[PDB]
């Protein structure tokens, strides 16, 4: 029962039938259908062969629209007449007209209210956009309703930026320039977002806290929940998502100053006037957000495959199960992959095989509401994972395109993937007879090494956050995605829309379910190697190179102002010395492993412990400034996220516009000192024990 025995039990037909099963009825967090799906998944995993499958439930705060009083945006004239209403519901896709329990598009946790005022265009609603708006063109956004497009920055940052500018309310729309791909038809003819299409999402700023009412501790049945006023990241002004048919037919009358540049203008046939006023100007818009926030229960599925030799070691494979409406891509295209992997491991166990280490299979809940399922489970099991967790693998949205296989993980995994992809067959068009490694390298080369595929950084934003930004467990993700040099749009056009159906995947994305098969193969090989290898496939020499690169980047970001560094005596020599010591100690450790004999079990356990706890050595118990739950000194999210060393980046952001330069540069020095100490301590953990 080697790697091939498990690898050849993966079949595309099973993935296809599982995906068809999942994407039929709405599966929203806190709804009954999600509970039924969780029960079905638990029963199927028990059938597959896992020793024990159980349900973990948490009571967390979610938000729902008021079905009796649906949310909408209207235009009222001078005498109180609704001369204009937006769509109350996204038009259902063909074949799903009779499907019920489809919540209309809405922004989760949006505060209730009835704001009314003039409109103003703020483009992507980034900080620079408000900078150009009011500090340059002299247009105060206070007491106004801002209109923004979906874009690169996360929507919670958009709403907070609108909040600090005093805006009455925010209106987010998915511009065709950012989502409507050229040439391809709209759904159901193609896969583009139609005018009725609206993108749902949550607009809070949790900063890795999980449940807004129970930050840092699990939301059990005896948890104490803070007041709504003192919550974490809850917005203060109403926000509502809108499709571009409503918007194009909304901002025609908007009149005022000309757009600052072509960047502000999108693709609609709208003048895109930035100044306040409707030019037909006495009328004003009014929003009717009636959303309600309540505490509801969410359920996570946890299945166990106990190890044979090392039951103390946990290798976790997981993903979320909730969806906004259907989830043909996010997340059921990954849930089917997880189901197939679990079935393969179960039949492998049934023939008599059993891995050295424990394997935990996870199905998360309330992830679209702020990662409220994985975070709470990790908070409950913080100690077990801290002292035992080897690695975590996240499976979600196996398909986002049909061009390349993207992988993002900690550097310790870099070598392992290169060994894994060299065996699996490439499913790409052409490239017949080649391994997955060859196709991946050809279609996504690394800038540093021509013959090596590029592996991206593990940027936060999904279920791996609590396992990598707070606990410090080596996390990895692999999924098929599109070209980046030719496809300008971000994600897929039908993201968080109502048209994420099984027909979409079966027709335009994965007709033969071969990319699903190869993504399942990648994830399953990752878990199998991590749970069955004698020596953990971790390489610190891969971490050293990226440490050097990150230090070189942050040094330039600081050296942006050389005369200011010289005036206040800012130096990076401690960080450079720590990184150099890391490289030397990692070299010695690698040679020790190569010399090492594997017959003696206890010393093998010691060596594997040294390999395992390397990632935990980058965790600062005090966390980043004002963000207690972002603790990974190297990869924690920045306060201006989209670079590594978040502390130094945060201290170096907007230092020119500071009242007291000495205090700011002292903070920069403090962050440099913290980073250097953490790197040196991580290096010292790998030195000769005793």
């Amino acid at each position, epitope marked *: 029962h080697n790697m091939k025995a498990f690898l050849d039990e993966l079949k595309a037909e099973n993935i296809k039938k599982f995906l068809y099963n999942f994407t039929q009825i709405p599966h929203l967090a806190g709804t009954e259908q999600n509970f039924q799906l969780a029960k079905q998944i638990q029963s199927q995993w028990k059938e597959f062969g896992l020793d024990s499958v159980e349900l973990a439930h948490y009571d967390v705060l979610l938000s729902y629209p008021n079905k009796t009083h649906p949310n909408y945006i209207s235009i009222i004239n001078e005498d109180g007449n609704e001369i204009f209403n937006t769509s109350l519901f996204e038009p259902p896709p063909p074949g799903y007209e009779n499907v019920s329990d489809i919540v209309p598009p809405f922004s989760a946790f949006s505060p209730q209210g009835m704001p009314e005022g003039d409109l103003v265009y703020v483009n992507y609603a980034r900080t620079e956009d408000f900078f150009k708006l009011e500090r340059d063109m002299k247009i105060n956004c206070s007491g106004k309703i801002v209109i923004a497009r979906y874009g690169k920055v996360f929507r919670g940052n958009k709403v907070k930026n609108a909040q600090l500018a005093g805006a009455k309310g925010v209106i987010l729309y998915s511009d065709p320039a950012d989502y409507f791909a050229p040439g391809v038809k709209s759904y159901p003819d193609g896969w583009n977002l139609p005018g009725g299409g609206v993108q749902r999402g949550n607009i809070l700023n949790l900063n890795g806290a999980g449940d807004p009412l129970t930050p840092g501790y699990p939301a059990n049945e005896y948890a104490y929940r803070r007041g709504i006023a003192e919550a974490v990241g809850l917005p203060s002004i109403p926000v509502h998502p809108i499709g571009y048919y409503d918007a194009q037919k909304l901002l025609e009358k908007m009149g005022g100053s000309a757009p600052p540049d072509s960047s502000w203008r999108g693709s609609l046939k709208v003048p895109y006037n930035v100044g306040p006023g409707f030019t037909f100007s006495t009328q004003k818009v009014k929003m009717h957000i009636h959303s309600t926030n309540e505490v509801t229960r969410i359920y996570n599925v946890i299945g166990t495959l106990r190890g044979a030799v090392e039951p103390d070691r946990y290798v976790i494979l997981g993903g979320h199960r909730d969806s906004w409406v259907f989830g043909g891509i996010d997340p059921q295209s990954g849930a089917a992959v997880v189901h197939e992997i679990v079935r393969s491991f179960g039949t492998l166990k049934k023939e008599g095989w059993r891995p050295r280490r424990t394997i935990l299979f996870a199905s998360w809940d309330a992830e679209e509401f702020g990662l409220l399922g994985s975070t709470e489970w990790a908070e409950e099991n913080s100690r077990l994972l801290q002292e035992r967790g080897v690695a975590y693998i996240n499976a979600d949205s196996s398909i986002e395109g049909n061009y390349t296989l993207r992988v993002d993980c900690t550097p310790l995994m870099y070598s392992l993937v290169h060994n894994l992809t060299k065996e699996l067959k490439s499913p790409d068009e052409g490239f017949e007879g080649k391994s997955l490694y060859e196709s991946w390298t050809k279609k996504s080369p690394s*800038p540093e090494f021509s013959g090596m595929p590029r592996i991206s950084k593990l940027g936060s934003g999904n279920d791996f956050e609590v396992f990598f930004q707070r606990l410090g467990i080596a996390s990895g993700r692999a999924r098929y995605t599109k070209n980046w040099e030719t496809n300008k749009f971000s994600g897929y056009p039908l993201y968080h829309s109502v048209y994420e159906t099984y027909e979409l995947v079966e027709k335009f994305y994965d007709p033969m379910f071969k990319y699903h098969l190869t993504v399942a193969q990648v994830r399953g090989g990752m878990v199998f190697e991590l749970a069955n290898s004698i020596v953990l496939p971790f390489d610190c020499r891969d971490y050293a190179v990226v440490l050097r690169k990150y230090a*070189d980047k942050i040094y*330039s970001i600081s*050296m942006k102002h050389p005369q200011e560094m010289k005036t206040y005596s800012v130096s*990076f020599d401690s960080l450079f010395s720590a990184v150099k010591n890391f490289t030397e100690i990692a070299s010695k450790f690698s040679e020790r492993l190569q010399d090492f004999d594997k017959s003696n079990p206890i010393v093998l356990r010691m060596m594997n412990d040294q390999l395992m706890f390397l990632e935990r050595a980058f965790i600062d118990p005090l966390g980043l400034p004002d963000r207690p739950f972002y603790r990974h000194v190297i990869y924690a999210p920045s306060s201006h996220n989209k670079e590594s060393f978040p502390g130094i980046y945060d201290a170096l952001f907007d230092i020119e516009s500071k009242v007291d330069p000495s205090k700011a540069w002292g903070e920069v020095k403090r962050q440099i000192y913290v980073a250097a100490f953490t790197v040196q301590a991580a290096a010292e953990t790998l030195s000769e024990v005793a």
Partner: nanobody
Framework: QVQLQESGGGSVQAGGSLRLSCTAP????????MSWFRQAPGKEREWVAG????????SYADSVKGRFTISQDNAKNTMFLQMNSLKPEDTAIYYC????????????????????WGQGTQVTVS
């Protein structure tokens, strides 16, 4: 904030030998990723040439190779390009880019990897 005061642009016939200098004040006592990016009229920005002072290795693009050379000035914080035998259709505004490095393992060849930028100018006629 430093603006890498640079000069050396011009407009001559194709095949001419031009020389563009770029210096980074405050970078005299440090290594960096000195490099250049072209901006054709209507096209995008692409890598052209660069030097890694940490290892002192100079690299050029496949098309650029054999036509561009980099020379270091007496002052450490200053590099020169000599463009000899300019092709008829290399008319593109040059952008000098540089990021300070200490270990200086690899030379970035992407625009987004460079921190502090400049505004050059270059036009070549037939």
């Amino acid at each position: 904030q430093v603006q890498l005061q640079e000069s050396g642009g011009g407009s001559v016939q194709a095949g001419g030998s031009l020389r563009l200098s770029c210096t980074a004040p405050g970078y005299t006592d440090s290594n960096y990723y000195m490099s250049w990016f072209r901006q054709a009229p209507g096209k995008e920005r692409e890598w052209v040439a660069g030097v890694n002072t940490g290892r002192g290795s100079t690299s050029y693009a496949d098309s650029v190779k054999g036509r561009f050379t980099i020379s270091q000035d007496n002052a450490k914080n200053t590099m020169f390009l000599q463009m000899n035998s300019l092709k008829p259709e290399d008319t593109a505004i040059y952008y000098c880019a540089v990021a300070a490095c200490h270990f200086c393992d690899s030379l970035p060849k992407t625009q987004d990897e460079y921190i502090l930028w400049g505004q050059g100018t270059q036009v070549t006629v037939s």
